[PDB]
Ligand binder design. Sequence first.
Ligand SMILES: *[C@@H]1O[C@H](CO)[C@@H](O[C@@H]2O[C@H](CO)[C@@H](O[C@@H]3O[C@H](CO)[C@@H](O)[C@H](O)[C@@H]3O)[C@H](O)[C@H]2NC(C)=O)[C@H](O)[C@H]1NC(C)=O
Ligand SMILES: *[C@@H]1O[C@H](CO)[C@@H](O[C@@H]2O[C@H](CO)[C@@H](O[C@@H]3O[C@H](CO)[C@@H](O)[C@H](O)[C@@H]3O)[C@H](O)[C@H]2NC(C)=O)[C@H](O)[C@H]1NC(C)=O
Ligand SMILES: *[C@@H]1O[C@H](CO)[C@@H](O[C@@H]2O[C@H](CO)[C@@H](O)[C@H](O)[C@H]2NC(C)=O)[C@H](O)[C@H]1NC(C)=O
Ligand SMILES: *[C@@H]1O[C@H](CO)[C@@H](O[C@@H]2O[C@H](CO)[C@@H](O)[C@H](O)[C@H]2NC(C)=O)[C@H](O)[C@H]1NC(C)=O
Ligand SMILES: *[C@@H]1O[C@H](CO)[C@@H](O[C@@H]2O[C@H](CO)[C@@H](O)[C@H](O)[C@H]2NC(C)=O)[C@H](O)[C@H]1NC(C)=O
Ligand SMILES: *[C@@H]1O[C@H](CO)[C@@H](O[C@@H]2O[C@H](CO)[C@@H](O)[C@H](O)[C@H]2NC(C)=O)[C@H](O)[C@H]1NC(C)=O
Ligand SMILES: *[C@@H]1O[C@H](CO)[C@@H](O[C@@H]2O[C@H](CO)[C@@H](O)[C@H](O)[C@H]2NC(C)=O)[C@H](O)[C@H]1NC(C)=O
Ligand SMILES: *[C@@H]1O[C@H](CO)[C@@H](O[C@@H]2O[C@H](CO)[C@@H](O)[C@H](O)[C@H]2NC(C)=O)[C@H](O)[C@H]1NC(C)=O
Ligand SMILES: *[C@@H]1O[C@H](CO)[C@@H](O[C@@H]2O[C@H](CO)[C@@H](O)[C@H](O)[C@H]2NC(C)=O)[C@H](O)[C@H]1NC(C)=O
Ligand SMILES: *[C@@H]1O[C@H](CO)[C@@H](O[C@@H]2O[C@H](CO)[C@@H](O)[C@H](O)[C@H]2NC(C)=O)[C@H](O)[C@H]1NC(C)=O
Ligand SMILES: *[C@@H]1O[C@H](CO)[C@@H](O[C@@H]2O[C@H](CO)[C@@H](O)[C@H](O)[C@H]2NC(C)=O)[C@H](O)[C@H]1NC(C)=O
Ligand SMILES: *[C@@H]1O[C@H](CO)[C@@H](O[C@@H]2O[C@H](CO)[C@@H](O)[C@H](O)[C@H]2NC(C)=O)[C@H](O)[C@H]1NC(C)=O
Ligand SMILES: *[C@@H]1O[C@H](CO)[C@@H](O[C@@H]2O[C@H](CO)[C@@H](O)[C@H](O)[C@H]2NC(C)=O)[C@H](O)[C@H]1NC(C)=O
Ligand SMILES: *[C@@H]1O[C@H](CO)[C@@H](O)[C@H](O)[C@H]1NC(C)=O
Ligand SMILES: *[C@@H]1O[C@H](CO)[C@@H](O)[C@H](O)[C@H]1NC(C)=O
Ligand SMILES: *[C@@H]1O[C@H](CO)[C@@H](O)[C@H](O)[C@H]1NC(C)=O
Ligand SMILES: *[C@@H]1O[C@H](CO)[C@@H](O)[C@H](O)[C@H]1NC(C)=O
Ligand SMILES: *[C@@H]1O[C@H](CO)[C@@H](O)[C@H](O)[C@H]1NC(C)=O
Ligand SMILES: *[C@@H]1O[C@H](CO)[C@@H](O)[C@H](O)[C@H]1NC(C)=O
Ligand SMILES: *[C@@H]1O[C@H](CO)[C@@H](O)[C@H](O)[C@H]1NC(C)=O
Ligand SMILES: *[C@@H]1O[C@H](CO)[C@@H](O)[C@H](O)[C@H]1NC(C)=O
Ligand SMILES: *[C@@H]1O[C@H](CO)[C@@H](O)[C@H](O)[C@H]1NC(C)=O
Ligand SMILES: *[C@@H]1O[C@H](CO)[C@@H](O)[C@H](O)[C@H]1NC(C)=O
Ligand SMILES: *[C@@H]1O[C@H](CO)[C@@H](O)[C@H](O)[C@H]1NC(C)=O
Ligand SMILES: *[C@@H]1O[C@H](CO)[C@@H](O)[C@H](O)[C@H]1NC(C)=O
Ligand SMILES: *[C@@H]1O[C@H](CO)[C@@H](O)[C@H](O)[C@H]1NC(C)=O
Lengths: 143, 547, 465, 37, 49, 49, 49
Amino acid sequence: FVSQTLTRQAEVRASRQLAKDKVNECVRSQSQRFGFCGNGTHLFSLANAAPNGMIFFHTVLLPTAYQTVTACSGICASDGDRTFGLVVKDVQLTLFRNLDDKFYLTPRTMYQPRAATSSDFVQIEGCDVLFVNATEIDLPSII
Amino acid sequence: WFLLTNSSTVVSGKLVTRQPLVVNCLWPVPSFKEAASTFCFEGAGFDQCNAVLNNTVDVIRFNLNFTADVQSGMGATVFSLNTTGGVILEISCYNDPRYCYVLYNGTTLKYLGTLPPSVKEIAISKWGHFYINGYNFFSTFPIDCISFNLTTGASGAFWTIAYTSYTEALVQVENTAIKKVTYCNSHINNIKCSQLTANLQNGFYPVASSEVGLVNKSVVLLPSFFAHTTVNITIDLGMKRSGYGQPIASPLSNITLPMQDNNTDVYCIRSNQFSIYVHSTCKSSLWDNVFNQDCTDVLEATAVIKTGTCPFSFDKLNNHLTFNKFCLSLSPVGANCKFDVAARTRTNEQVVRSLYVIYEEGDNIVGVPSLSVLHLDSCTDYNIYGRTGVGVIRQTNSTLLSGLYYTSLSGDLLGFKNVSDGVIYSVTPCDVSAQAAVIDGAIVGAMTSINSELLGLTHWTTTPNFYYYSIYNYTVDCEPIITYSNIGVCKNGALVFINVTHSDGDVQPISTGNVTIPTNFTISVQVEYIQVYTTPVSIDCARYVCN
Amino acid sequence: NVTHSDGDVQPISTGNVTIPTNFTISVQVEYIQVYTTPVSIDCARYVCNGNPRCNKLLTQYVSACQTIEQALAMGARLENMEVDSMLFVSENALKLASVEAFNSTENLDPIYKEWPNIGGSWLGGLKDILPSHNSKRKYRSAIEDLLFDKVEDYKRCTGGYDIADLVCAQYYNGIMVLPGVANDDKMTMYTASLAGGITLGALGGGAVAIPFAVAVQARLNYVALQTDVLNKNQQILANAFNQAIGNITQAFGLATVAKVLAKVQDVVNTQGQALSHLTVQLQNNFQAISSSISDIYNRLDPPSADAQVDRLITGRLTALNAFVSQTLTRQAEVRASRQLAKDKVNECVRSQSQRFGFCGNGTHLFSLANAAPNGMIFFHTVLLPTAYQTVTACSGICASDGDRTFGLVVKDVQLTLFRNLDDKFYLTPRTMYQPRAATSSDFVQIEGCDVLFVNATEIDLPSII
Amino acid sequence: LANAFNQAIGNITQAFGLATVAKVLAKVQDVVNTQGQ
Amino acid sequence: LGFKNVSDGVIYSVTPCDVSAQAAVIDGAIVGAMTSINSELLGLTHWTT
Amino acid sequence: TAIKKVTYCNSHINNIKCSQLTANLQNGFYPVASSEVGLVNKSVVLLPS
Amino acid sequence: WFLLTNSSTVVSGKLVTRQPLVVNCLWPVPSFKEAASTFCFEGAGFDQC
Ligand SMILES: *[C@@H]1O[C@H](CO)[C@@H](O[C@@H]2O[C@H](CO)[C@@H](O[C@@H]3O[C@H](CO)[C@@H](O)[C@H](O)[C@@H]3O)[C@H](O)[C@H]2NC(C)=O)[C@H](O)[C@H]1NC(C)=O
Ligand SMILES: *[C@@H]1O[C@H](CO)[C@@H](O[C@@H]2O[C@H](CO)[C@@H](O[C@@H]3O[C@H](CO)[C@@H](O)[C@H](O)[C@@H]3O)[C@H](O)[C@H]2NC(C)=O)[C@H](O)[C@H]1NC(C)=O
Ligand SMILES: *[C@@H]1O[C@H](CO)[C@@H](O[C@@H]2O[C@H](CO)[C@@H](O)[C@H](O)[C@H]2NC(C)=O)[C@H](O)[C@H]1NC(C)=O
Ligand SMILES: *[C@@H]1O[C@H](CO)[C@@H](O[C@@H]2O[C@H](CO)[C@@H](O)[C@H](O)[C@H]2NC(C)=O)[C@H](O)[C@H]1NC(C)=O
Ligand SMILES: *[C@@H]1O[C@H](CO)[C@@H](O[C@@H]2O[C@H](CO)[C@@H](O)[C@H](O)[C@H]2NC(C)=O)[C@H](O)[C@H]1NC(C)=O
Ligand SMILES: *[C@@H]1O[C@H](CO)[C@@H](O[C@@H]2O[C@H](CO)[C@@H](O)[C@H](O)[C@H]2NC(C)=O)[C@H](O)[C@H]1NC(C)=O
Ligand SMILES: *[C@@H]1O[C@H](CO)[C@@H](O[C@@H]2O[C@H](CO)[C@@H](O)[C@H](O)[C@H]2NC(C)=O)[C@H](O)[C@H]1NC(C)=O
Ligand SMILES: *[C@@H]1O[C@H](CO)[C@@H](O[C@@H]2O[C@H](CO)[C@@H](O)[C@H](O)[C@H]2NC(C)=O)[C@H](O)[C@H]1NC(C)=O
Ligand SMILES: *[C@@H]1O[C@H](CO)[C@@H](O[C@@H]2O[C@H](CO)[C@@H](O)[C@H](O)[C@H]2NC(C)=O)[C@H](O)[C@H]1NC(C)=O
Ligand SMILES: *[C@@H]1O[C@H](CO)[C@@H](O[C@@H]2O[C@H](CO)[C@@H](O)[C@H](O)[C@H]2NC(C)=O)[C@H](O)[C@H]1NC(C)=O
Ligand SMILES: *[C@@H]1O[C@H](CO)[C@@H](O[C@@H]2O[C@H](CO)[C@@H](O)[C@H](O)[C@H]2NC(C)=O)[C@H](O)[C@H]1NC(C)=O
Ligand SMILES: *[C@@H]1O[C@H](CO)[C@@H](O[C@@H]2O[C@H](CO)[C@@H](O)[C@H](O)[C@H]2NC(C)=O)[C@H](O)[C@H]1NC(C)=O
Ligand SMILES: *[C@@H]1O[C@H](CO)[C@@H](O[C@@H]2O[C@H](CO)[C@@H](O)[C@H](O)[C@H]2NC(C)=O)[C@H](O)[C@H]1NC(C)=O
Ligand SMILES: *[C@@H]1O[C@H](CO)[C@@H](O)[C@H](O)[C@H]1NC(C)=O
Ligand SMILES: *[C@@H]1O[C@H](CO)[C@@H](O)[C@H](O)[C@H]1NC(C)=O
Ligand SMILES: *[C@@H]1O[C@H](CO)[C@@H](O)[C@H](O)[C@H]1NC(C)=O
Ligand SMILES: *[C@@H]1O[C@H](CO)[C@@H](O)[C@H](O)[C@H]1NC(C)=O
Ligand SMILES: *[C@@H]1O[C@H](CO)[C@@H](O)[C@H](O)[C@H]1NC(C)=O
Ligand SMILES: *[C@@H]1O[C@H](CO)[C@@H](O)[C@H](O)[C@H]1NC(C)=O
Ligand SMILES: *[C@@H]1O[C@H](CO)[C@@H](O)[C@H](O)[C@H]1NC(C)=O
Ligand SMILES: *[C@@H]1O[C@H](CO)[C@@H](O)[C@H](O)[C@H]1NC(C)=O
Ligand SMILES: *[C@@H]1O[C@H](CO)[C@@H](O)[C@H](O)[C@H]1NC(C)=O
Ligand SMILES: *[C@@H]1O[C@H](CO)[C@@H](O)[C@H](O)[C@H]1NC(C)=O
Ligand SMILES: *[C@@H]1O[C@H](CO)[C@@H](O)[C@H](O)[C@H]1NC(C)=O
Ligand SMILES: *[C@@H]1O[C@H](CO)[C@@H](O)[C@H](O)[C@H]1NC(C)=O
Ligand SMILES: *[C@@H]1O[C@H](CO)[C@@H](O)[C@H](O)[C@H]1NC(C)=O
C-alpha cells in the first residue's frame, strides 16, 4: 500500500507543477509560448475548483476567414548615386503595399494594419532580389 | 422479501448472488381465506397461480406478517414436514409468547425459541433449511412434502405464497432490504452482472465468444500391448445402532483386495491397463459385534472410497491416469498417500477404514473406463499424451522433425505429432475472447477472431484484423458513439473508420509574396482538468496488523 | 573529465565584448515517448482457461475481475483521447511533404522562378527526413525505416493451419494487444505535415510552395535581423546541414544517436518483458497438484478439485493485479513525456521559441521531426559559432546642448552599442554579429550620465538625436 | 466575441450537467475511483 | 459491527474500546492530541471540541 | 558491542520514542493508541436451546 | 542432430541446456560400408575416428 501511495504522490507532484505553470502563465499573465494555453490564439483564462484539482477555461480566438495581402521582403531605395535597402525592424510584422500604393505593416496573428513610418525601418547596405523599388512619393514617409 | 444467508447480513451494496428469485408460481391469499394445502417439491401442483413455470421447486416462501393474528388449523402445529425416511417432523408453537419446538413422535427434539413480534418471511428449502427474515436459524432432514394450514382470520390481512427456484442475479441492497434485482439471463444482463452495474456506460466490454458443454472425448496415447486387469475391491461394512437409534459404522469393517502372490494384504497393477471397482456388502450386528444379520431400515450402507490424502480420486482412476507403479495396501509401510473408506447411509457418511496407496508417477500403466480415438474439426475434451483440456483439433500440412508434442509459454498444448506417420495436428480453443460494443444499454456489435455468430448478432463484415458482428444489415457515413484508435461504432451498430483531424495549417513568417493573415475571429472555449493534490491517509500500523 | 565550453555570452555593453560571428550547423537528435501499447485482458479467461466449473468458483471474486478490467479499460481510454487531441494534419502541407514534391518545380510559386526546386541546396539532408514513395511499407523517410527495422491480426489465430506462435498463444490466455498501427500511421502523417508546412506559402487553398532556403532565412531574421544581404552565407549552412544528416543516417543504419537507440530499444524491451512475465505465471502451481485446471478436474472429484483450483484462482488474481499496477504506473510516466513531446512540437517545430536552451544546445534555427516506435524523433538544427568578433561597447552616450547635459541609452536592451572605426555608432544583437547604424529612434533620453558613458560630439549628434 | 463566449459556456455548463468536457469527466472520475479502490 | 436480539428485534452496536489518536509532539513533549473519544488520554486533561 | 544510551519504555512520551526507535523526536504528529485495556467482564450471546 | 527432451519440444528460441554435444569421436560411414561393431560406454575403443 505504502509503495503505491508514494508512487502516486510523485505523479501528482509533476501534475501540480503543470497546474502551477498554467495558472502563472495562462491566468496571471499573457504567455508567449505557442500552443501552451490551449489550441488557438490565447486571449484569457479563468479557473474553477474540481475534486483533487482544478479546471481551466481557456478562451481562445478562432479565425473563420483570412485576408490576403501582397507582401514585400523589403524596400530598395536610392538618393543620388547611393543605393541602399530598408527592412522592417520588427521581425513579427508583415510589410505590404495597399491599394493607395502606400506601405502598411500588420502583425501576423490578426489583420490589424497600420501605416508604416520611418522609425519602423532599418537601413542596410544592399537590396535583395525580392525588394520593391521605392519612388519619390513614398520616400518622405519611410526615411 | 429478503436475501437468504447462512451467516452475516448485507446492510447495503451490490452483490452477485445465487438466490431463490425465480418464481415458478405465485399464490396470493385474500383477506379472508385459509391457505391450507399440501405442497411437494418434486412435482408441485401449481393450481393456485396468479405465467407458471412448470419445474422442480427449490424453496417455498411464506410472505406474511406472522403477527399475533396468524393461527393454524393444526393448532400448535404450524408446519408438518414429510422427510426422506418416511419420517414426519412437526414445527409447533405453545404458550408455555408462543414458543416453537421441533417434535417427532410427540416429544420435542429441539427448542427453536419464541417467535419474534417481527417476522415477515419464512422460507423452507427442500434440503431442510428454515430461513426467517433471511437468516438460516435452523434445519431438519431433507423434506419431500410440507403440509400447512395458515390464516390471518378476522384481521383482514393479505399475504402471498411463492414457489421459487435458484438463479444467479445482481441484487442491490439498502438497509438490509432488496431494492433492485437484475437476472443474469441474457447476453446484455451477463455483462451487467460481471460489471456489478445495472446501468452500463457506453463502451467496449470483454466477453466470451461462446460457451461449451457436451462434447466427444478424444484420447491419444503411445502404442503398447493390450494387457487388461480388473481389480475387484470388496468392502464388508459392519453396521449397528447406537442408543439414540442413528447408525454407527464399525471400525471392524473388512477390506479384501484381489488375491496376488498367495498373500492378499497387498495388491499391485502388473498389467498395462486396468479398471478398479468397489463392491459394497452390508451386514448388521447387535452390540456383540456379530455381523450375521441383514441391513435394513437405517443400517443400510454403501461402501464408498474418498480421496483422503492422494492427489487423485479413487473414482477417477478409471479415466486415463497413468503411473509407472500403483499398489494398494492394508498396511502403511511405504505408502505415499491413503484413501478414506466410508459407510455412506441415507444421511451421514462415516469412515470405517483406510486404504493405503503406493505409487510412482509415470506412463507405463494406464487406467481405463473398460486407446487412441481422435475427433477432428469439432470441439472435444482431449487427453493427449497426458495433457488434458478442451479445444478443436485439426490436421495441418506443417512439418516438424523433432518431438512428440508442442506447448506454449503458459503450458498449454498447441499441437502434437501422430507417431505412425509424422502428421502434425494443431490444437486451438473452442472459444475466444471478444469485445462487445455496448451503446445505450444494448449490444450493437462485437469484435471477434472466429467467423461465427455470437451474442445474438447475425450480420457481419470482415475488416483487416478481425471479424465484426452486428445488428446493422451487412451483406456508411454515420457518427460513431464509442471509439478506440481508428475504429468507431455508430448507434445503429455500423462500423466506421476514423481519419485524423484536419486543419488549414499554421501561419508562417513569410513576407515575400501573397500571404494570408487571420482576420475574422470568434471565440472558442476549451476545458481541461489538472490534478493538484491527493487525499492523504494516516495509518496506525499496530492497530491495522494487531486489532 | 567534464565537458568544457567557451561559456555563455553575457549582456555586457561596457567595454570590450565578444559577439558570435562565424556560424555553421549542428544537428542534435532526441527521442520522446508519446504512447504505450495498451493491453486488454479477459480476467475470466486468464484465470479460468475456458473451464465452466472454475468460472463458477470465480464469481466469488467477481469484484476482483471488475476492478482489473475497469482499470485497464479506463487507462486505455484516457490515453486514446490524449493522443487524438494531439495529432492533426494540414491537407496542403501534407501534399508538399514528400521528397518528390521538394525535388519538383511544379508546386513552386512563380516569383521564385530563379530557384530550381524547393530546398535544392538543403535537399541533400531533407531527402532522408521527408517521406518518400520509393520506400518500404508506405510513405516513410529513410531514417524512419532504419529505426523501425532495428526494432496485429487475430483472424489467423483460429485458423488451425499451423502451430500457434507467441502472439496467438497469448491471445488464447485472454491477452489482447490493441491496435497500435494506426498511431504509427498517424504519427508519420503528423510529422510529415509539420515539415511540409514550413514551405507552404499561404493557408487560403492551393499547395503553393516557397523555397526551403527562403523559409530558413525567415528563421535567421528571428534570431537576429540580417543585414548582410549581399553575403550569400546560406550555402555554407546548407552544406553543414547535409553533412550532419548524412552522419546521422549512417549512424542509425553522434552521442545523440547512441542515446536515441538506447532509449528506443529500452521502451520496446520493457513492454515485451512486462507482458511475457504475465504468461510465465500461468505455469505456477500455487502449492497445488497442478498448474492446469483441466488436469485437476480429471484427477479429483469436485469436493477436492475445487480446493485445488481455488489456490490457482487467488494466485492468478494476485499476479494479474501486479500487472495492472505496473501498467498504470507506466501510463502516468508516458503521459508526462507526452506533454514534453507536445511542448517540443509547439515551441520548436511550429514556432520560434524564446526559451533559452529548450530546443537543443546552441542557438535554435529550426526543427524537423520523424516517427519512431512508441514516439517521435526531433531533429534540432542549431547554429554553432566557430569564432567571435570583438567590439568596444558603450554603456550609453553623454550628450549636451548649451548648458543642458543629458544621457542617451539604448531603448532595446538586447542590443549592444559600440563605436566603429569611422567613429560612428552601431547597434548589434548579441546572438550574431549583425550590426546596423544607430539612429535617433533607437535611443532613450534620460536626465543624467553615468561614469561609463561616452561623450558625444557635434559630428555624432544629428544621427543620434 | 462576448456572444460567442456566452454560448460556449452555455454548452459547457449543459454538458457537465465538447470533446474537452468528455475528457474532463473521464479524468476526474478516474482520480476518485483510483483512490477509493 | 452490530447484532440483533432474537427475542425482541433490538439492534445492538459494537465499537472498539480504544481508537487511534494523533499525538502532537513539540520539543520532546506531548502538548495535545487529536481523538474521536471524549476521554482523557496521554496525561492530557484539558480539552476543546 | 557496548551500551551507550538507555531509554525506558515507561511513559507516554517514551513509548513514542521506543516505537520510533528515536531517543530525540522531531517536532510533528505521531499515531498513538488513545488507551489500553485489560481486566474486563465477559459477554456471551448464543441462540436459545 | 536434435535436442534431447523428456517432454515437450522447443519449436524456436534460445535456451541454456545440458546436452550430449561434446564429441569424443566421430565415426563417418561411407556409402557402401557396414557399420558393424561392439560399443561399450565404460571405455570405448575409439578406433574409427
Ligand atoms: C447454506 O449452507 C449449506 C451448507 O453449507 C448449503 O447446503 C447446500 O445447498 C445446496 C443448494 O441448495 C444443495 O445443492 C443440491 O445438491 C444436490 C446433491 O446432493 C444436487 O443434486 C441438487 O441439484 C443441488 O445442487 C446442497 O445439497 C446443500 N448441502 C447441504 C444441505 O449441506 C446451502 O446452500 C447454503 N444456503 C444459503 C442460502 O447460503
Ligand atoms: C530424462 O529424465 C530422467 C529421469 O527423470 C533423467 O535420468 C537421469 O539422467 C542422469 C544424467 O544422464 C543420470 O545421472 C548420472 O547419475 C549417476 C548417479 O547414479 C552418476 O554417477 C553419473 O555420473 C550421472 O550424473 C541419472 O542417473 C538418471 N537417472 C535416472 C535414470 O532416472 C535423464 O537425464 C533426463 N534426460 C533428458 C535428456 O532430459
Ligand atoms: C470578414 O467579415 C466581413 C463581414 O461578414 C466580410 O465583409 C462582407 O463581405 C461580403 C462578401 O464579399 C460583402 O457582400 C459584404 O457587403 C461585406 N460586409 C461589409 C460590412 O463590408 C469580409 O469580407 C470578411 N473578410 C474576410 C477576409 O473573410
Ligand atoms: C384448515 O383448518 C380448518 C380449521 O381451522 C379446517 O376446517 C375445519 O374442518 C373440520 C373437519 O371437517 C370441521 O369439523 C370444522 O368445523 C372446520 N372448521 C371451520 C372453521 O370451518 C379446514 O378443513 C382445514 N383445511 C384443510 C385443507 O385441511
Ligand atoms: C495416426 O496415423 C495412422 C496412419 O495413417 C492412422 O491409421 C489409419 O487410419 C485409417 C482411417 O480409419 C485406416 O483406414 C488405416 O488403415 C489406418 N492405418 C493403419 C496402419 O492402421 C491413425 O488412425 C491415426 N491416429 C489417430 C488417433 O487418428
Ligand atoms: C485546433 O483549432 C483549430 C481551429 O483554429 C482546428 O481547425 C479546424 O478544424 C475543423 C475540423 O474539425 C475544420 O473544419 C476547420 O476548418 C479548421 N479551422 C482552422 C482555422 O484550421 C483544429 O482541428 C484544432 N486542433 C485539433 C487537434 O483538433
Ligand atoms: C497575388 O494575388 C492577386 C490576386 O488577387 C494576383 O493579381 C492578378 O494577377 C494576374 C496576373 O496574371 C492579373 O491578370 C489579374 O488581373 C490580377 N488581379 C486580380 C484581381 O486577380 C497577383 O498577381 C498575385 N501576385 C503575387 C506576387 O502573388
Ligand atoms: C553545447 O554546444 C557547444 C557548442 O556551441 C559545445 O561547446 C564546444 O565543446 C567542444 C568540446 O567538445 C570545444 O572544443 C568547443 O570549442 C566548444 N565550443 C564552444 C562555442 O563552446 C558544448 O560542449 C555543448 N554542451 C555540452 C554539454 O556538450
Ligand atoms: C579593447 O581591445 C583593444 C585591442 O584590439 C585595445 O586597444 C589597444 O590599447 C593599447 C593601450 O595600452 C594600445 O597601446 C594599442 O595600440 C591598442 N590597439 C591595438 C590594436 O591593440 C583597447 O585598449 C581595449 N579597450 C577596452 C576599453 O577594452
Ligand atoms: C531529383 O530529380 C533528378 C531528375 O530531375 C534526379 O536525377 C536523376 O537520377 C536518375 C537516377 O534515378 C539518373 O538516371 C538521371 O540521369 C538523373 N538526372 C539528372 C539531371 O541528374 C535526382 O536524383 C533527384 N533527387 C532526389 C533527392 O530525388
Ligand atoms: C560526416 O561529416 C563530415 C564532416 O565533418 C563529412 O566529411 C566531408 O565531406 C565533404 C564532401 O561532401 C568533403 O568535401 C569534406 O572535406 C569532408 N570533411 C571532412 C573533415 O572529412 C562526411 O562526408 C559526413 N558523413 C556522411 C555520411 O555524410
Ligand atoms: C570569419 O571568417 C572569415 C572567413 O574565413 C574571416 O576572414 C578572413 O580572415 C583571415 C585572417 O585574418 C584573412 O587572412 C582573410 O583574408 C579573411 N577573408 C576575408 C574574405 O575577409 C574572418 O576573420 C572571421 N572572423 C572572425 C571574428 O573569426
Ligand atoms: C450552444 O452553441 C450554439 C451555437 O453554436 C447556441 O445556439 C445559438 O443560440 C442563439 C441564441 O442565444 C441563436 O441566436 C443562434 O442562432 C443559435 N445558433 C445555432 C447554430 O443554433 C446554443 O444556444 C448553445 N447552447 C447553450 C446551452 O447555450
Ligand atoms: C529596380 O531598379 C533596377 C534598375 O536600377 C531594376 O533592374 C530592378 O529590376 C528594379 N526592381 C524592381 C522590383 O522592379
Ligand atoms: C409421507 O410420504 C410417504 C412417501 O414417501 C407417504 O407414503 C406417507 O403416507 C406420507 N405421510 C404423510 C403424513 O403425509
Ligand atoms: C411412537 O411412540 C410410541 C410410544 O408409546 C411407540 O409405541 C410407537 O411405536 C412410536 N411410533 C413410531 C413411528 O416410532
Ligand atoms: C462428435 O463429433 C462429430 C463429428 O464427427 C460431431 O458432428 C458431433 O457433434 C460431436 N459430438 C459431440 C457431443 O461433440
Ligand atoms: C468383478 O465383479 C463383476 C460382477 O460380479 C464380474 O463380472 C467381474 O468378472 C469381477 N472381476 C473379477 C476379477 O473377478
Ligand atoms: C470382518 O472379519 C472379522 C474377522 O477378521 C469378523 O470378526 C467381522 O465380523 C467381519 N466384519 C464384517 C463387517 O463382516
Ligand atoms: C502358494 O504358492 C506356492 C508356490 O509359490 C504354492 O506351492 C502353495 O501351495 C501356495 N499356497 C497357497 C495357500 O496358496
Ligand atoms: C497449407 O495449406 C494452406 C491452404 O489452406 C496453404 O496456404 C499453405 O501454404 C499450406 N502449407 C504447406 C506447408 O503446405
Ligand atoms: C438487408 O438488405 C437487403 C438488400 O436490400 C434486403 O433484401 C434484406 O431484407 C435486408 N435485411 C434486413 C434484416 O433488413
Ligand atoms: C476520411 O473519412 C471519410 C469517412 O468519414 C472517408 O470517406 C474518407 O475517404 C477519409 N479520407 C481519408 C483521408 O482517409
Ligand atoms: C582532462 O583529461 C585529460 C585526459 O583525457 C587529462 O590529461 C587532464 O589532466 C584532465 N584535466 C582535468 C580538468 O582533470
Ligand atoms: C566628458 O566631459 C567631461 C567634462 O564636461 C569630463 O569630465 C569627462 O571625463 C568626459 N567623459 C569622457 C568619457 O571623456
Ligand atoms: C462490568 O460491568 C459494570 C457495569 O454493569 C462495570 O461498572 C464494571 O466496571 C465492569 N467490570 C469489568 C471488569 O469490566
